[PDB]
Amino acid sequence: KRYEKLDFLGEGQFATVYKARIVAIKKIKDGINRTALREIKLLQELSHPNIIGLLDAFGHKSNISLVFDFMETDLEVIIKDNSLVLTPSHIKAYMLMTLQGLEYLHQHWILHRDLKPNNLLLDENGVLKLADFGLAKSFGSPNRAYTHQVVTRWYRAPELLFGARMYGVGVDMWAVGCILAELLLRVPFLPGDSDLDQLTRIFETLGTPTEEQWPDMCSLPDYVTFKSFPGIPLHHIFSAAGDDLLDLIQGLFLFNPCARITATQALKMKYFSNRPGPTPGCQLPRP
Amino acid sequence: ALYEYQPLQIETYGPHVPELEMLGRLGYLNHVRAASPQDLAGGYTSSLACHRALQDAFSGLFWQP
Amino acid sequence: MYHNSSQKRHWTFSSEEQLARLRADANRKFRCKAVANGDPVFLEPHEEMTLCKYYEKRLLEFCSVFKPAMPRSVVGTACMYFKRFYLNNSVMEYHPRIIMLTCAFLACKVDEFNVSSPQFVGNLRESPLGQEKALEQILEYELLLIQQLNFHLIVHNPYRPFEGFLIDLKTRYPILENPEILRKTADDFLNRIALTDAYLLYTPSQIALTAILSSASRAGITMESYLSESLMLKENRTCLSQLLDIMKSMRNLVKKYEPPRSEEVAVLKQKLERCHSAE
Numbered sequence: 116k117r118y119e120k121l122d123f124l125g126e127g128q129f130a131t132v133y134k135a136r137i138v139a140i141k142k143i144k145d146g147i148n149r150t151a152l153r154e155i156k157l158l159q160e161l162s163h164p165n166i167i168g169l170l171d172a173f174g175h176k177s178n179i180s181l182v183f184d185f186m187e188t189d190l191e192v193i194i195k196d197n198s199l200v201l202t203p204s205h206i207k208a209y210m211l212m213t214l215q216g217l218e219y220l221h222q223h224w225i226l227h228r229d230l231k232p233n234n235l236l237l238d239e240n241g242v243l244k245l246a247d248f249g250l251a252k253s254f255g256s257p258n259r260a261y262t263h264q265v266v267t268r269w270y271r272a273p274e275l276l277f278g279a280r281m282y283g284v285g286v287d288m289w290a291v292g293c294i295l296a297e298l299l300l301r302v303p304f305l306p307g308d309s310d311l312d313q314l315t316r317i318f319e320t321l322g323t324p325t326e327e328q329w330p331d332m333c334s335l336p337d338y339v340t341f342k343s344f345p346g347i348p349l350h351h352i353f354s355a356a357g358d359d360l361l362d363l364i365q366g367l368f369l370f371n372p373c374a375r376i377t378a379t380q381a382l383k384m385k386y387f388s389n390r391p392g393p394t395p396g397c398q399l400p401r402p
Numbered sequence: 403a404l405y406e407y408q409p410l411q412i413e414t415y416g417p418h419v420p421e422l423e424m425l426g427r428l429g430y431l432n433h434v435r436a437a438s439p440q441d442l443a444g445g446y447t448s449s450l451a452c453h454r455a456l457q458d459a460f461s462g463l464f465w466q467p
Numbered sequence: 468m469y470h471n472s473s474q475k476r477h478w479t480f481s482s483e484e485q486l487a488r489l490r491a492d493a494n495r496k497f498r499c500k501a502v503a504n505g506d507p508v509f510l511e512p513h514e515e516m517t518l519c520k521y522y523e524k525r526l527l528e529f530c531s532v533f534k535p536a537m538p539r540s541v542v543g544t545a546c547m548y549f550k551r552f553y554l555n556n557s558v559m560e561y562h563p564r565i566i567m568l569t570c571a572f573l574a575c576k577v578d579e580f581n582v583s584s585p586q587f588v589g590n591l592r593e594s595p596l597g598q599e600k601a602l603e604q605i606l607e608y609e610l611l612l613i614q615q616l617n618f619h620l621i622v623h624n625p626y627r628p629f630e631g632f633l634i635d636l637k638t639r640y641p642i643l644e645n646p647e648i649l650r651k652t653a654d655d656f657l658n659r660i661a662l663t664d665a666y667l668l669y670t671p672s673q674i675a676l677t678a679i680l681s682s683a684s685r686a687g688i689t690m691e692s693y694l695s696e697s698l699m700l701k702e703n704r705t706c707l708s709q710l711l712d713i714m715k716s717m718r719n720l721v722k723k724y725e726p727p728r729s730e731e732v733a734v735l736k737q738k739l740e741r742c743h744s745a746e
């Protein structure tokens with residue numbers, strides 16, 4: 116039509132992403148794919164600097180391709196880059212942009228449900244945008260059922276792994292915490308091999324929660340009991356993490372989703388309003 | 403250059419919506435269905451549905467094309 | 468959220484005259500296209516409106532008996548799709564019979580109402596060959612419908628604002644004891660409101676509140692103290708006056724609505740069929 120093809124960018128369960136003229140094209144009897152329609156319908160109603168902006172959509176018959184602004188990198192490339200030092204200011208800036216985008220998304224009653232470093236895209240100016248809204252859904256309605264097989268397993272919240280059909284911003288918040296952990300360690304925090312393995316790793320690192328820290332944990336459909344792991348204290352996992360950062364991590368990793376800090380609560384924490392300030396976009400590391 | 407939290411300024415063109423954590427004490431939650439224990443376990447509360455419904459009721463009530 | 472939605476931004480219009488201008492422009496554009504391609508055949512814009520009202524009621528009938536039970540939000544989204552499509556498109560270019568089914572199909576996809584295509588076409592009262600051809604036509608028209616909506620797929624319906632208003636009444640307006648009895652009549656008014664062009668001219672909150680207060684007025688219950696006191700409109704006098712005027716105009720819109728006459732509908736349907744076959 117009007118776009119060429121320049122460079123293959125990625126390949127997922129539902130679509131393949133390449134570059135064009137710079138923009139990124141996501142090429143996706145049932146009809147037009149529901150993932151593309153979900154992305155279009157959600158990104159048309161959202162406008163925030165930390166959320167990916169849909170620019171165009173085209174196709175023929177049941178085929179569909181979406182057009183976005185070209186995003187220079189993603190957080191996974193940053194994390195996996197052994198030559199880039201992730202200073203506390205850089206981590207704070209990434210977390211801040213992620214949380215601002217997530218707060219804007221949550222006020223409009225939409226959960227991302229696919230938060231992970233490769234879905235957090237960065238441009239040459241350093242602005243972080245949430246991307247890949249193919250699994251995002253609106254929340255706040257009791258009659259809308261959800262599926263618990265959302266979020267990548269390594270970043271899946273324990274209530275999701277326990278089969279929570281109804282859930283709130285915590286499923287994103289937990290993923291945020293995992294991303295934060297992946298920022299601090301430079302390796303995946305909880306690299307499980309299955310839902311059982313993921314739950315085991317969560318409970319062996321953070322301690323097996325009881326009813327006191329999760330009053331209705333035994334009501335989730337696929338709830339499975341585990342041995343009561345003491346859990347490694349957070350200051351040993353993240354040796355170079357200050358008290359405010361430890362408080363933020365603890366809030367993000369609270370087992371109770373209701374008690375788990377929201378994006379607004381996380382943004383209000385002393386960690387973000389503390390020395391040193393978040394890195395400006397022009398100075399954030401680029402691979 | 404420290405960060406300072408600023409609330410999102412999104413004009414609603416409608417009446418003020420009571421705060422989410424204020425809904426219980428003002429009696430709104432007495433008119434929404436109570437969340438089940440499994441709903442609570444996942445982080446879903448009746449306050450979410452009540453807040454969303456009130457926001458939808460008040461959004462753009464005073465707006466004129 | 469409605470207050471920064473595409474529905475508010477691009478699909479809420481200033482007056483009925485603007486809607487008539489758009490529909491007349493679409494009609495004349497199809498006329499020019501058909502003459503350039505190579506007259507009594509063409510339909511007038513009022514005939515297009517009569518056919519559109521008839522086929523919107525047909526869309527309501529299709530969504531009413533749809534199995535599994537289609538949610539009201541999906542039905543409202545589909546009807547809004549129909550109205551928006553025929554704002555800028557002639558029924559003589561795209562048949563409303565297929566466009567309404569495509570509206571329902573796209574709305575089912577958009578509102579996260581999971582139905583397979585065979586399940587969707589099973590709801591038609593035709594032979595399976597007819598259902599297969601209908602599915603083919605819907606698949607051909609799906610992208611066209613999406614483009615003609617300018618890719619604005621989220622539709623804000625008055626139903627959730629109506630529920631929120633009911634919650635607020637039950638909370639902050641004790642003098643309206645048991646507000647629930649106002650539901651059915653208000654819902655009925657909502658249905659009638661949906662027949663008009665109100666959904667293109669008023670916010671969902673305004674439509675819901677107009678339905679509620681029309682139901683209250685029909686009940687002998689006077690409650691503008693809800694507007695002045697609970698909604699704090701006693702301070703901004705102009706805001707309360709504007710809201711009252713908006714509700715009055717919407718009630719007038721409901722008043723001056725005439726359903727399509729079946730005798731006229733048969734003639735217009737034959738004219739439209741001749742338009743499609745001839746071209």
Ligand SMILES: CC(C)c1cnn2c(NCc3ccccc3)cc(N[C@@H](CO)[C@H](O)CO)nc12
Nearest residue numbers: 124125132139183185186187188189234246247
């Ligand atoms: C498609 C659009 C949002 C979009 C716009 N840019 N972009 C990038 N750029 C980052 C990058 C990565 C490698 C090499 C060069 C640049 C990755 C990506 N990844 C997709 C999969 O390819 C993932 O699903 C998140 O969107 N999607 C997109």
